[PDB]
């Protein structure tokens, strides 16, 4: 069991600005055989099922916009929105895939201010 | 393309018996390694099992040890998650979910399903 | 990759259209003129080697043909 | 360690000159052809009388 | 693209290894070879071109191995 | 009509004689080459005396 910790528990941003949300870990995700770093990001829109954004962290699932971008290394990952749309509200979930327990982080959210 | 569909998903009292299938289609269903995932309403989602490609090689999680059943047919392309001793807190929505195709993960998430609903009151 | 070995002479064929009968007709061509168009001085080169190793005329135009179209389906 | 990808493209490409049959139901295999003798004997015209 | 046409050749080439020279360094010569052993028939006419085009033996045998290396690759 | 399935691994050797590069935020290339005037008038040794 991995303690995940989102730092802001909604956010408020304008149309055109910048949103970054910071998910920090309890442990290290950094499988020390390969050095890769497992973390993942799910968008979950109003009222759907929710979808994958980054797996990993510098890598992004296809049928994603570029504006999304996933960043940090050893238990502190960050991501990024450089221009936010009215389809980017939502639940976006940081989970560790490091251990076989599964442990997402608690539910952020993203409104438009 | 891929096509995850939900079924088994109604109100039940507590303690009953109930199994909820996963239909498949849009891919090679027998090379692959399912989840299961749930969310209850107002909290986040909640990991409930897995069975890798390998069927004996099942696993779940601490708070639905030893009280769930986790089981994939290949060839009718379903999912079955017979799950006993039901309590109004485990009531969710759940999930059925695909492995990741492009990774490095042995498990990870791809594509979520519709999702089913089952409701679980006295 | 597979994607070189095409399934073009096998000889087993009939009346009806293959997989990309028309799509797959000038694939080569276009490669190689692309290339040509790509890569001009090899032209000279050809020409040169040609000219150095060929006695006849013939033997100069078939050589020429061949080297260019050997190089850009050599790779 | 790097996985190639999807072969799928190439081999569409791979095939180029293979002939394609229907596959809903069994093997509707088209694009065949048949040699046959007809007998042509025991036909009758029907009309004449 | 269609895997025909690669990247190598072009230059802009450095010390650091490029991408699959591990696995390309020997791919046309091995499809060369194996559509040779797979249609050994080829090699009858290839020969027969040959010794009807050129009066010595240094184009016979250049005009030979342009015939086997561009029959397989331009299939 | 036919889509003609998925080219992600079928120009993943068409693209075979290039050189890699991370693309992980910042664009590091790890390849390449350049020049210096290494103008060494102002680099004394230390501990000479
Ligand atoms: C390939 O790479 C993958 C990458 O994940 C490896 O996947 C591993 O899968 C196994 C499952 O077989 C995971 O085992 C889990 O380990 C957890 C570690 O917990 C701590 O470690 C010690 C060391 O044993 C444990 O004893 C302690 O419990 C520590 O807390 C462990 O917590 C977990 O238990 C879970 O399952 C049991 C049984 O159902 C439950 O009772 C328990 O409550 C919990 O739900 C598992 O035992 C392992 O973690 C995975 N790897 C990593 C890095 O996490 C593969 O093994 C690699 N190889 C192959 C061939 O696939």
């Known amino acids: 069991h991995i303690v995940m910790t989102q730092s802001p528990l909604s956010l408020s941003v304008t149309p055109g600005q910048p949103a970054s949300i910071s998910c920090k870990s309890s442990?290290?995700?950094?499988?020390?055989?390969?050095?890769?770093?497992?973390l993942y990001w799910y968008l979950q829109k109003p009222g759907q099922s929710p979808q994958l954004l980054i797996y990993e962290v510098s890598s992004r699932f296809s049928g994603v916009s570029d504006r999304f971008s996933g960043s940090g290394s050893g238990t502190d990952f960050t991501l990024k929105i450089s221009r936010v749309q009215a389809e980017d509200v939502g639940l976006y979930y940081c989970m560790q895939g490091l251990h076989l327990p599964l442990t997402f982080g608690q539910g952020t959210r993203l409104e438009i201010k | 393309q891929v096509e995850l569909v939900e079924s088994g998903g109604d109100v039940v009292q507590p303690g009953k018996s109930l199994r909820l299938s996963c239909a498949a289609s849009?891919?090679?269903?027998?090379?692959?390694?399912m989840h299961w995932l749930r969310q209850a309403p107002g909290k986040g989602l909640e990991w409930v099992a897995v069975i890798s490609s390998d069927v004996n090689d099942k696993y779940y999680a601490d708070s639905v040890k030893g009280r769930f059943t986790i089981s994939r047919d290949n060839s009718k392309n379903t999912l079955y998650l017979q799950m006993n001793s039901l309590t109004p807190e485990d009531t969710a929505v759940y999930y059925c979910?695909?492995?990741?195709?492009?990774?490095?993960?042995?498990?990870?998430?791809?594509?979520w399903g519709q999702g089913t609903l089952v409701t679980v009151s006295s | 990759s597979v994607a070189l070995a095409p399934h073009v002479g096998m000889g087993l064929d009939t009346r009806t259209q293959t997989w990309m009968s028309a799509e797959g007709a000038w694939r080569q061509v276009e490669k190689v003129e692309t290339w040509a168009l790509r890569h001009p001085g090899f032209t000279i080169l050809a020409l040169f080697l040609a000219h150095y190793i060929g006695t006849s005329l013939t033997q100069k135009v078939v050589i020429f043909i061949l080297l260019m179209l050997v190089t850009p389906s050599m790779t | 360690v790097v996985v190639l990808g999807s072969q799928e493209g190439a081999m569409h490409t791979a095939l180029t000159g293979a002939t394609e049959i229907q596959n809903s139901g069994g093997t509707s295999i088209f694009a065949g052809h048949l040699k046959c003798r007809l007998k042509m004997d025991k036909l009758e015209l029907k009309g004449m009388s | 693209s269609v895997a025909l046409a690669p990247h190598v050749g072009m230059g802009l080439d450095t010390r650091t290894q490029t991408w699959m020279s591990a696995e390309g360094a020997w791919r046309q010569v091995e499809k060369v070879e194996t559509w040779a052993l797979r249609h050994p028939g080829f090699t009858i006419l290839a020969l027969f071109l040959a010794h009807y085009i050129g009066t010595s033996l240094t184009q016979k045998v250049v005009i030979f191995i342009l015939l086997m290396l561009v029959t397989p690759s331009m299939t | 009509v036919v889509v003609l399935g998925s080219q992600e691994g079928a120009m993943h050797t068409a693209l075979t004689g290039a050189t890699e590069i991370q693309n992980s935020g910042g664009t590091s290339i790890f390849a390449g080459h350049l020049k210096c005037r290494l103008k060494m008038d102002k680099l004394e040794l230390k501990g000479m005396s």
């Open positions: 979910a695909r492995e990741q195709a492009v990774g490095t993960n042995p498990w990870a998430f791809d594509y």
């Open positions: 849009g891919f090679t269903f027998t090379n692959y390694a």
């Open positions: 442990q290290i995700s950094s499988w020390g055989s390969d050095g890769k770093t497992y």
